[PDB]
């Protein structure tokens, strides 16, 4: 049992809330206006933990290292060349070390569960490992070591571009045909289940798979699983799709696939008004990765229009140049402000508070995209939560939604003090028990690279 003076519950902010948590890490009882009665008295305001709906773990290793001009027009595409050269040298052991360290940093930032969009499958020569699931299993073990919730999204990747272009050499570690991909999903069932981790279907992008492959995978019977795909991140993809099909990426997807609530459309950055409307209507989740989209010069998503139409969204750290719930949400809003040259862009008809609007939205979309029972403190949901700093003058002087505004718009990561996943404290007073060992292994890997 734990006790919070203030907690953000599904119906809104509450006081003196006593939480009972079962041995399996599930919220069993939630009583506001209660007595602490022996329960653990928490040190600040309690929020549901934030799901991270999009990650490529190995990229954290190169974070910030690609900030070197080599052309007057460096771009997403020259960055990718550099990313390819990086992933070409990574051993299974290095990948696991990077992932563990990353997930630890994620937890400290307030991310309690992650969707790993995992496309590094094979050995350095593009040959499969003795166990084809080698690298997927190492990701699961890293998540277990850090203690973070995990939806693993093994990625189908087969082509270099629309129309089934042959994969490039730089892509060799990613490549599977549909049969091998479906076998991978099969192999992953037992170990993921044992770990308490989740699974999802995943197409890298419309560039990387064919329409026929999409049909194959969706017909394979995994009808309960999330479906994730990168889409419309870069103008070049939009242009190439038009030249291939006479349609834009999102436009094509919606014409050809039965997109619904199972789906997470990552980035979706270049969505015209018709595409925005189709997304909102479908109930699919837009996977927004603000810090990476800014870092890569992707552009600004039409979040205000999307949100006005009932769109669902969540946040992902993606390339992991930033690991900050605060930064993603703050700059989601700030990007809309810079575009419109106005303030207070992302709010609901029933919720004028910006911080609360953003947090509510990202919690819900994120839980939906991961396919996990998370994103709110209700009986039957998993006990994933974070505790803010009760001694912080800004937070202590604030109440309810004002407190969210202070944190998200005037504060930072260090205001997140304690973090619980499935009823287990994994961060205490900003510290993770595995941080020392992990950093030691991590710095060695950085040196090797
Ligand atoms: N930020 C985008 N990253 C993608 C690149 C791609 O879409 O090809 C990736 O990591 O595979
Ligand atoms: Zn991505």
Curated annotation (Swiss-Prot):
Its EC number is 3.5.3.13. Its cofactor is Zn(2+). GO terms for cellular component: cytosol. It is an enzyme of class 3 (hydrolase). It comes from Pseudomonas aeruginosa (strain ATCC 15692 / DSM 22644 / CIP 104116 / JCM 14847 / LMG 12228 / 1C / PRS 101 / PAO1). Pfam families: Amidohydro_1, HutF_N. Pathway: Amino-acid degradation; L-histidine degradation into L-glutamate; L-glutamate from N-formimidoyl-L-glutamate (deiminase route): step 1/2. One of its GO terms (molecular function) is deaminase activity. It catalyses: N-formimidoyl-L-glutamate + H2O = N-formyl-L-glutamate + NH4(+). Keywords: Histidine metabolism, Hydrolase, Metal-binding, Zinc. Catalyzes the hydrolysis of N-formimino-L-glutamate to N-formyl-L-glutamate and ammonia. GO terms for biological process: L-histidine catabolic process; L-histidine catabolic process to glutamate and formamide; L-histidine catabolic process to glutamate and formate. It comes from the Bacteria. Homodimer. The keyword Iron-sulfur does not apply. InterPro entries: Amidohydro-rel, HutF, HutF-like_N, Metal-dep_hydrolase_composite, Metal_Hydrolase, Metallo-dep_hydrolases. Zn(2+) binds at residues 54, 56, 230, 318. Belongs to the metallo-dependent hydrolases superfamily. The gene is hutF. N-formimidoyl-L-glutamate binds at residues 59, 80, 119, 204, 207, 233. This is Formimidoylglutamate deiminase. The active site is at 267 (proton acceptor), 318 (proton acceptor).
């Amino acid at each position: 049992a734990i006790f919070a003076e203030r907690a953000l519950l599904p119906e809104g902010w509450a006081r003196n809330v006593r939480f009972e948590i079962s041995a399996d890490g599930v919220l069993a009882e939630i009583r506001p206006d209660a007595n602490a009665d022996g329960a653990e008295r928490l040190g600040g305001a309690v929020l549901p933990g934030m799901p991270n709906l999009h990650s490529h773990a190995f990229q954290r290793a190169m974070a910030g290292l690609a900030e070197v001009a080599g052309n007057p027009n460096d771009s997403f595409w020259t960055w990718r060349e550099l990313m390819y050269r990086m992933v070409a040298r990574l051993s299974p052991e290095q990948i696991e070390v990077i992932a563990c360290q990353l997930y630890i940093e994620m937890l400290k930032a307030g991310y309690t569960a992650v969707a790993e969009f995992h496309y590094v499958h094979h050995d350095l020569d593009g040959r499969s490992y003795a166990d084809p699931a080698e690298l997927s299993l190492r990701i699961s073990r890293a998540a277990s070591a850090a203690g973070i919730g995990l939806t693993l999204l093994p990625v189908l990747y087969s082509h270099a571009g629309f129309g089934g272009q042959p994969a490039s050499e730089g892509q060799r570690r990613f490549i599977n045909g549909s049969e091998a991909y479906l076998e991978l999903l099969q192999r992953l069932r037992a170990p993921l289940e044992a770990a308490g981790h989740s699974l999802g279907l995943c197409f890298h992008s419309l560039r990387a798979v064919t329409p026929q492959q999409i049909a194959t995978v969706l017909a394979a019977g995994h009808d309960d699983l999330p479906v994730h795909i990168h889409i419309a991140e870069q103008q070049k993809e939009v242009d190439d799709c038009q030249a291939w099909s006479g349609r834009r990426p999102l436009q094509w997807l919606y014409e050809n696939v039965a997109v619904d609530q199972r789906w997470c459309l990552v980035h979706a950055t270049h969505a015209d008004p018709a595409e925005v409307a189709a997304m909102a209507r479908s109930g699919a989740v837009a996977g927004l990765c603000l810090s990476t989209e800014a870092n890569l010069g992707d552009g600004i998503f039409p979040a205000t229009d999307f949100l006005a139409q009932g769109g669902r969204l969540g946040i992902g750290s993606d390339s992991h140049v930033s690991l900050s719930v605060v930064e993603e949400l703050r700059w989601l809003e700030y990007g809309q402000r810079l575009r419109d040259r106005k303030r207070n862009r992302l709010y609901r008809d029933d919720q004028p508070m910006i911080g609360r609007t953003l947090y509510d939205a990202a919690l819900a979309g994120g839980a939906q995209a991961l396919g996990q029972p998370i994103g709110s403190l209700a009986v039957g949901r998993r006990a994933d939560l974070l505790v803010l700093d009760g001694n912080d003058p800004y937070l202590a002087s604030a109440e309810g939604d004002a407190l969210l505004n202070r944190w998200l718009f005037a504060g930072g990561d260090r205001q997140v003090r304690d973090v619980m996943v499935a009823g287990r404290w994994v961060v205490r007073d900003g510290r993770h028990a595995g941080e020392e060992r992990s950093a030691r292994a991590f710095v060695q890997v950085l040196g090797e690279l």
